[PDB]
Amino acid sequence: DPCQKQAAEIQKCLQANSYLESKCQAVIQELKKCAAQY
Numbered sequence: 001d002p003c004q005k006q007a008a009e010i011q012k013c014l015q016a017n018s019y020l021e022s023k024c025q026a027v028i029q030e031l032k033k034c035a036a037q038y
Contacts, residue, residue: 002038
């Protein structure tokens with residue numbers, strides 16, 4: 001599929017970082033780049 005792994009790993013990352021998106025923005029960059037591909 002497009003990026004469901006990235007979405008799951010973004011959730012996982014946020015969960016592990018108390019929803020501090022800033023620690024998982026590198027993974028959101030990956031999701032954005034993924035989305036731009038797919």
